[PDB]
Structure formats: C-alpha cells, structure tokens
Subunit: 31 residues, 5 copies
C-alpha cells in the first residue's frame, strides 16, 4: 500500500554490514 | 492477512549471516 | 490482538546468535 | 497508542549484544 | 502518518554498531 511495507525490507539491507565485518577480519587473516 | 506479516519473518533470516561470520573466523582458527 | 505483535518479539530472539558467535571465538581463545 | 509502538524500540536494545561481543574479544586482546 | 514509520528507520541505526565491532578488532590488528 505504501513505503511502510518497504521500510522493513530496507532494514534487511543490514545483512551487508555482516560481510563488512568479515571483510576486515579476513583482511588480516587472509587464509 | 498479507505478506506484511511475513515481511518481519523474512528479516529473521538475518540469523544466517551470524553463522556466516563464524564460518570465516573458524576457517582460520579451525579448532 | 494477534501474533502480529509477537512477530517482532520473535525476531528479538536473534540476540542468541550473538552469544553463539562469541562461543566459537572463546572456544579458541579460552581466556 | 499501545506497546505495539514500543515493541520495535525494545528490539533496538539488541545494540547491547554488539558491545558484549567486543567485550569478550577485548578480554583476550586487551590492547 | 506518525513516528511509528520512523521507529523502524531508527532501528536501522544499528548498522553503526557493526563498524564499532570492527573498530576494536582493527585497533588490535591494525593492518
């Protein structure tokens, strides 16, 4: 009906932050 | 009534990203 | 009124996944 | 109107779990 | 219509906590 439905979906984008964390962790561990 | 109810449930899938983080961490620590 | 109210609460369970991450991290660090 | 509005706010408390993770990580790294 | 719509957006701020975790992790790893 409105963006109110997409608002929750937008939050779902937080899943990217997780890979960001591993990005730094792997940047030092490599293997 | 509508998917609006499942939308929140979908976000719950974010729980998988957590194991993904430990996956990389354990891939270097093993033990 | 309906489970729609509990749906958000259910997501709150995600707080457990956090301790799960530290569980593996501490399983290698111990101290 | 009702707690339904606070329910989402309650979930926001999950922000504490994040510091909990760093707490253990820093407990071994110190520096 | 009301803040009820912004409430979900506010939770989105949790994305900051993720960088906070890497902040401590990188504070010890540097590289």
């Amino acid at each position: 009906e409105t963006g109110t439905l997409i608002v929750n979906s937008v939050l779902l984008f937080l899943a990217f932050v997780v890979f960001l964390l591993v990005t730094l962790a792997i940047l030092t561990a490599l293997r």
